[PDB]
Design a protein around this ligand. Structure first.
Ligand SMILES: [Cl-]
Ligand SMILES: [Cl-]
Ligand SMILES: [Cl-]
Ligand SMILES: [Cl-]
Ligand SMILES: [Cl-]
Ligand SMILES: [Cl-]
Lengths: 152, 151, 151, 152, 152, 150
């Protein structure tokens, strides 16, 4: 069992692709418990052209989305192990979002850390909760539940 | 005015491409409610990655879309149609709560945003409501955001 | 097989972002006619330069959509719904004539494509029809296109 | 009213912007007469991602759009000469198009040359006709009427 | 083999894709010897939205990148002839860059031409040098050593 | 001059913009002397769509561009100081590039640190040498001569 999971590994599990794959690396994975990953925030991202001009602030909902993706990594894997074939048939459905609070704006230069831990699961359904952090300080908090749907 | 088109939204809201997710405004009640909408089309960059071969408007972006409609209701409530101020402000998400996604939103759908204020208090606003495609609740959520100074 | 959604459209037409301008086929009748549409939203790249501070959907893209709708008509009319014969048949534009733009299309409009066959000769199709938004005609044209081999 | 114009000049005159500004240079111009300009076609254009994957073709409709923009340049400069403060207050709108023929496909590498003569003009409404040429060969034929409107 | 290649061919040999495929057509080619190709520069390129606003200047570094790809096409072609199947398995790593000189700026409407000659070469390593030219004039000269490393 | 500048400062001094502003933050700065800045590298960059499909590698040539800009920023503040004004006027333009060595491919998740120090400098022609590093190690090195045009 490996510790870190790089972009190539991520591409092999999550179905998300540019410009919606918002997780760059996985520094810690504990099946069925807690995942710690991150996405680098640079100014060279199309999203900054509109949010907002002359004041780049990484969208709050995209922080949520990032945590949701970090969680999804937990789901797919825990549910099948690091297996790209069994993962290529799925996608991830967002079911609920709760108790999310944004505390510090994220901007170019910040290492957006996703700290999530499972809270409950079953089948393709999983509920995860946690925070997003920059340089150790909390930037956001959230709870969300998702399903690993079928491409069909 | 009770209806507004993209021209006005561009003058009021600080958001721009690719983060302005509201096209037209159909109802507005200062300090009360506002319904609006955003057309979803395949000709949008997000669909390149969400998800290849299976385009699905990101759930988080439906929420953003509802937050913007609120922001527009908020801004006009505090200053009226005022382009010179809007450029001095930005919107900032505070919290998001009890948001549920029920039917996926796809290219071809007229994504309606229905919101009503629940807590007005100053710059800080709080609204709740649903997103609807063809008279059907596709999502629901409550959110709070602050219209604060730019810098 | 009367209503076709974006999913079905990707499997028939070779066009992809940012040049697939048809979001859903609402009517289709072999070798005769097709009714489809594409939603116009602000979150489209084209709007960054046409025109800044005044989003106007390009008339030529409206023609492009009508042609693409017609191409869907050709493909299915000639081979029913076949996702692979289609992976080997681009859509080349031959002529356009009698086109007229009447009402500017903008973000928030549903652009409906109404086309009928004027003449079919193998893979050389001549069509004609209009472009409508919320009831009124917005553009009208006639065009010819060939569904040649992809190489 | 010089005869040759570079993108720098085109920007101040035409309201069109990326990714809808399809004229890089003006080779020749004669008030209310004719205009010759061109647009280089490269693979490095977003339009090519979808038209068509694995087979790059510059859309015919854009060739038409390009000629319309050339006429526009010509019309702007004819109506008011080289003037950026009046131009800033205008937009160009397509009125009609007729007798367009697409003879040869345009692809990355080709130098898309536009050729237009004025068929009729009165006020903001201008009518022009001509061809689009690559290496001398007539790639396409087109006729169109466009108007200059106040951005208001 | 050949000595004239278009974008369909280029695409079949080099792994670069949008927005980093900076070579449109190969006009001249001599195995092991030299190579001449070009890329059309047009305002309808994303890079101009920022380099620079209201003053389009094709990035100097991108001129260099264009010469390396041209060198890469030449290298690949020299090593295996025209072979898409085998090329399909390679990447092009940049090794060293030297004696890079920018003389004239490259702007929209220019025909950025690549002139490369093979200095040294052993395995999947080729040190080449040449110049970038627009209208016969040398807009830049440079040297580099790329790497044709297998793709995985 | 100061010693900590954020994208909001960089924006006000460099002319580059999306998708060519390749410097996100300036952590350390000593006028006429050196500068230490950096650009975050994420997968969410358009460039990775073509360099390369299923194997994103930040282009070495963009690493150099990022180094140049850093020096450029150093150059301006190292004469007129953080002064948006003159800045809007003048404008960076690199005339040469020497001794560029690429040692480790940069990929999404790296924090490309820019380490530049002033070298053989004229007046409007600043030369700079230094390196780009990731997690302490040297991913690349290079020397550039830049002129503050107008
Ligand atoms: Cl936010
Ligand atoms: Cl979602
Ligand atoms: Cl076409
Ligand atoms: Cl138009
Ligand atoms: Cl440069
Ligand atoms: Cl490289």
């Amino acid at each position: 069992l490996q510790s870190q999971f790089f972009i190539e590994h991520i591409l092999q599990i999550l179905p998300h692709r540019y410009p919606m794959l918002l997780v760059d690396r996985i520094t810690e994975l504990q099946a069925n418990q807690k995942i710690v990953a991150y996405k680098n925030i640079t100014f060279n991202e199309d999203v900054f052209n509109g949010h907002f001009p002359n004041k780049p602030i990484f969208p709050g909902v995209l922080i949520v989305e990032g945590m949701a993706q970090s969680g999804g990594f937990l789901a797919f894997t825990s549910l099948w192990g690091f297996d790209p074939e069994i993962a290529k048939t799925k996608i991830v459905a967002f079911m609920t979002i709760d108790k999310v609070k944004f505390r510090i704006p994220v901007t170019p230069g910040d290492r957006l850390e996703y700290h999530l831990e499972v809270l409950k699961h079953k089948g393709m359904i999983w509920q995860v909760g946690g925070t997003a952090q920059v340089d150790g300080k909390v930037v956001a908090e959230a709870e969300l539940k998702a399903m690993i749907a079928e491409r069909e």
